[model samples]
Target: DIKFASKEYGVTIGESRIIYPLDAAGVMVSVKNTQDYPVLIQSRIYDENKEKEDPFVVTPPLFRLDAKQQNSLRIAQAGGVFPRDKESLKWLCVKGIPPKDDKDVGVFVQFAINNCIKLLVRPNELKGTPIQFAENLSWKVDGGKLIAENPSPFYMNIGELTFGGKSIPSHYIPPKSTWAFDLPKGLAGNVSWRIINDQGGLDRLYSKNVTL
Candidate 1:
C-alpha cells in the first residue's frame, strides 16, 4: 500500500499496534529507517478525528535518522479526559520524508510517506485476558443489520471479519458495548474475526453461528 514504508524510503513500526496500561506513565515505540539515504522521521498521536490535544505527549517529535538507524519513541500520559470504563483507541502517525541532498539544493521535489498504527488503552480494572473475554463474543444478523454483543468489561478491536467466506472490515467493539452494522451480503450462521489485543498482538476468534 502507498500508505506504508516502501522500498524507496523505509520506515518501520516495531509493532503493528500499541497497548497502554491504565496505570503506566508512558509507552515506548521502536521505529527504524531502512533506506540507504538519510531521512527525517516525525510522529504524532491523535484520536479518530485526527486531532491531538493536552494529556498526550510524544517526546522529541522530530528526529533525523541515518541509513539503517533506529529510534525509540516515548509516549506518555499526563492524565486527563480519556476513556475510563472501556478501552479507547487512537492513531500514531509516523511520517518519513527524504532530506534534500547537496546536489538537489536547486530542486524542491521529494516523496513523503505517512504510516499510521493503532493505539489501544485498556483500564486496570478490566479483568480477564483478552482471549478470555473476546472468546466469549457472539453475533447475529438482525433486520438488515449485524449486531455484536460484548458482555465483557474489556473492549475488543476487530480487524476483519470472515462471514459466509466473505471478508468484511471491522472496528472497535467496546465492552458492554453492542454495535450494529449493515449485514454482510451472504450472511449466514457463523462469523470469525481477528482482534487486536493488549501489547499490540493479533488473535483470531471464530465466532458462533448467527441468523440472517
Candidate 2:
C-alpha cells in the first residue's frame, strides 16, 4: 500500500482555513518549507463531495519550495456552480511531492503527502455565525435514528455528542439541513452536543430531557 508522508513533511501551512467569497476575485493561502530539503507542492480544489466532475482553479498549480521558503497559492472560481442559499464548503488539496532521488538496484518506496483543508465559499447573503447555529441546533430521537437539525444559515461543525451517559463521535450539521444518526435502544435522557468553534475548539450544548 502507498502511504502519504507525515503531516509535517516539510512545509507549514499559512492559512489552514480559507474563505472564498461568492462575489470576489479570489482568496490566497501560503505554505512555508521549514525543512532543509527542497519540496515540490501542488494544489487543486474540489467540492464538498470530493468528486472530479467540477473543480475550482488554483493559481500556480505547481510550485517549488526551497529550504525555508514560503509562497502563497491564489484560489479562485473556475466555472463551477456553487451553493447560493448559504456558504458552500469546498476543499483545497495541497500535496507535497518530494524531489525524486536516485535509487540503486535495490527496491525503494516513495510517497507524496496531500493535505485537504476547508475552502468555504461565503455568499453575500450568508447570515449569522457558527455560534448561533451551534446554539440553536437541536436533536431528538426519531424512529430508529437520532435526528439532528439546523435551521440557521450557518453550519454547525459538531465535534462531539453525548446523551444518556453515552457519547457519540464527531459529526457536522450543515446549514438548514438535517442529519440522522443511528439510535441506540433503551436509552432515554437529555441530549448534549458540542460544536467546533472559531479556534477549532469545542463548546458543549445541551437540550432538555430528550426522552424517547
Candidate 3:
C-alpha cells in the first residue's frame, strides 16, 4: 500500500525544492521502504538562525528504508532556502543577469534542500527555476514558461491576488498555472496565499515588471 497520502500537490517534488514553498507553508514528503533490510536516511535542516535541529525525526510519513523500498516525508516548508553546511547536496542559485549582458551576474547563492521556503518570493522570477502549477489552474502570461507536474483538478481565477502584502498581477502568474482551488472547495471571497523569494523582495520585482 502507498500508505500515507503523498501530498495535495502530488508524490513528486524536486529534492532541492527549487521554487517550491515551505516554512510558513511547506510540502509533505512521502517515502515507502519496500525491501527487507531496514535502512536509515538522515538529514539536517538549518533554520534561519543557522542552528541545527538534528536530523528530522523519522516517523509516520517518515518510515524505515528497506532494500528496494519506497517512503516519503512531509517537509512543512516552502522552496528556496540557502544552505551553507552540506556542500555536497544539490542546490539552486539566485541570479539576476542583465539581459544581453553576459557578465551582468547580480547574485548567485546555493538554495539548499533545507528551509525550502522563500519569504515573499514570486513564481516566475528565476531564469532556470520553474514554478509548478496545479493541473486545472488556468493562467495567462506575456512571456516565460510555466510548468505543471500534476495539477489539481480545480479552477482558479488567479486574477491578481494579494499575498503577504504583495500584489501578484495576472500576467505574472505564469500561463500554465494549475487550479489549486476547487470550484467551491473553500468559502467564497478572496482567499489568501503566500509567496516567497530568496534574492529579491516582492516589491522590488512587482513594481518594475520583472522583465527589468
Candidate 4:
C-alpha cells in the first residue's frame, strides 16, 4: 500500500509547491518532524519526463530528523538546459521512514510515507506573475468543448471551473497551452472560474459569457 505524507507521520512541508526562478541561486524547502521519536528522512528531485538525467540537486539527501526538529533542503539546478520560453516542472519527493522496534517480534508493518510536490522552474525573462497569467486566461466554447488557453509563460492553477452552472474537472493549465473540457449538450452562456493563489487559497471568482 502507498501513503501520502500526513499528520499521522508528524511531517509537514513548508510549501505545497516550489516556484524556482532561473536567475536565483537556489531555493530552500523546510520539512519538520513533529513527533516524539526520530525518523529517517530522505529527499530527492525527479524529472517529470522520466529522463535519465538530473535536472536539479537536493542537498543532504538522507538524514535523521529528531523529534520536534525542522530542517531545510536546498534545491538548485544541475546545469541542465531547460526551455527558456516556458516553465518546466519537476517532482520534489520527501519520504519519512519510521524506526522499527527491535522488541516487537510479531508480524507487523511499517509505512514509509512519501510526499511529492511540484517544482516549477521559471525563466527569469518570462514576464508577469502567475496570478496575472491566470487572470488573463482565454475561454471559449467550440465543437462541444470548453477550451481554456493560457497565453503567458507561467502555469495557471485554476479551481473548479463551471460553465452553464455545471462543474468541469479542469485544473492546471500549462504555460502557453490549452486545456479543453467536454461540454454537455445544450451547455452554454455563463462561465465562472477561480484561480488558486500562491498560498493555495482560492481567488475571487471570475465570470464570462461564451457562445455555444
Candidate 5:
C-alpha cells in the first residue's frame, strides 16, 4: 500500500490574490501546467460560501492546458451592484485535472487539485492603496478583547500580527470592518503587524502602542 505525502500540484497560479478595480475592464490570472502531461483546467468565481452565484465572470471557464504551457483567465464583473464605499470579496477557484488516458491500467489514484484565491473588487475612487490603509490600522484592547479596525475602503491582508508577545493568526480585514480576538492573559503593551502587498511580498513591520 502507498500513500502520497506531498501537497504539491501540477498547476501553479501566478498571483496569491487578485484585486480588481470597479471601473477597469477586467483582471487576468495566469496559470501554468508544470507537469509533463496535459491537464484540463477549469476556473470559476464563487461567493464566500463557495456558491456559484457570484458577481464576477470568468472567460474560457474550461480549457485544456498543454504540458509546460501557460494560460490566463480573465475575470470581469458581471451585473451585480456592490457597495461603493467598501471593497467586495470573492473566491476564484481553479482546478487541474489529469488526462483520462494517462492513468495506469492497474488500480491507481488520480488527483484533481483545486486552488482557491481571494478576489477583491475595489471601488475606483478609493482614497488610498491597501498598503497605505494597512499602515494606519487601529488596534485597541477593550473588555478583555483585542480589536483590529480597518477604516479604509481596501481589504487589508495581514501576514503576521502579534500582541503582548503572542502571535495572532494572520487574516484579511474587510474594508470598513473590524475583527476582534480574545486577548491573551495579562495582554498589554505594543501591537505589531505586517501586511501582504499586491505582489505577494511582505511589507515593512508596523507597531503601535495599544489603546485601552
Candidate 6:
C-alpha cells in the first residue's frame, strides 16, 4: 500500500431515487516494484458468481517507471452493480513479469466491485443506455421487490476471505450475500492510495462511482 495524496473520497454518484437503495463506490491500491525487474499491473472485477463479470479492465492502464520512479493511476469504479449483492464485487491487483529470470512479476492485479446492483430503474432513460449490461445483471423495481433475478450466466460467490479477513463468499459456487443493502443513492464508500516502483509499477490508485 503506498498512499492517497488528494481528494481521495466523496459523493461520486448523482441525484437518484432510492427504491431498494442500490448505489455505492470505493477502492484504492498502493504498490511498489521493489523487485529488480519490470512488471505489469492488472486490475480485475468479479461478480458474486466468481466468473469475471466485466473485466473492469481487461487491459488496465500500464506504467513502466524507472528503477526508482513513482507513478500514480486512477481506476473508475463500475456501475450497474446489483445493490443486494454488495459482496459480489471483488478487486484483485497483481503484478506480472516474465516469471523466469523475472519470476518476480507474473500477474500483479487488484480486484474490486461496486456495491452490487440488485435492482436498477431508469424511467426517464428507457431509450438511453443508462445500464450497460442491465439485461444480464439488473432488475426493475416494480411496485417494490426486484422483479428481475440475476441473469448473469455465472454464479457470484467466492466463499473465500480477503487479506482484511472480510469473508469473500465468491467461492461458494451457488451463494450470495445478505439481502439487506438498502438501495440508497447516498450509500457510498472508497479505497484510494499510492504506490512506488523499485523497478516496475509505482504510485497506483483508483476511484469508482464517479466514473461508473
Q: lDDT (CA) for every model shown?
A: 0.76, 0.73, 0.29, 0.79, 0.83, 0.29
Better of 1 and 4 by TM-score: 1
Which ranges of candidate 1 are over 4 A from the true structure? 1-7, 101-110, 180-189, 199-201
For 1-212, candidate 6 gives per-residue lDDT tens digits of: 45833212111111111111223232233434444444444334454344565424323455553333334433344565443422233444343332223467655443222222221211221232212222232223333222223333223222221212222122222122112112233322221222121121222332222112
Runs in model 5 deviating more than 4 A are 1-8, 101-108, 141-145, 182-189
Best by lDDT: 5
Tens digit of per-residue lDDT, candidate 3, span 34-145: 3233444433344334454322221333224455555555444333453322111122221111111177866544221222322122232223322222222322222332
Quote the RMSD, in angstroms, for model 5: 4.5
Q: Model 1: C-alpha RMSD to truth?
A: 5.4
**How would you order the candidates by TM-score, starting with the best?**
5, 1, 4, 2, 6, 3
Local error of candidate 5 at residue 170 (angstroms)? 0.7
Q: Least accurate stretch of 10 residues (summed lDDT) in model 4?
A: 1-10
lDDT tens per residue, model 2, 38-152: 8888888776788654457887889888878889998877666667887787788888777766866965677677887777777777765577667676667777677788887
- Tell me how candidate 3 scores on lDDT: 0.29
Candidate 5's residue-wise lDDT over 68-167, tens digit each? 9999999988778888988888999889988874876865566887889898888877777788767788988777777889888878889999886789
Q: Which candidate has the top score in TM-score?
A: 5
RMSD of each: 5.4, 5.2, 19.6, 5.5, 4.5, 17.3
Weakest lDDT window of 10 consecutive positions for candidate 2:
1-10
Give the candidate order by descending lDDT.
5, 4, 1, 2, 6, 3
Q: Which residue pairs come into collision in candidate 5?
A: none
Any idea what lDDT model 6 has? Answer: 0.29
Q: What is the lDDT of residue 108 in candidate 5?
A: 57
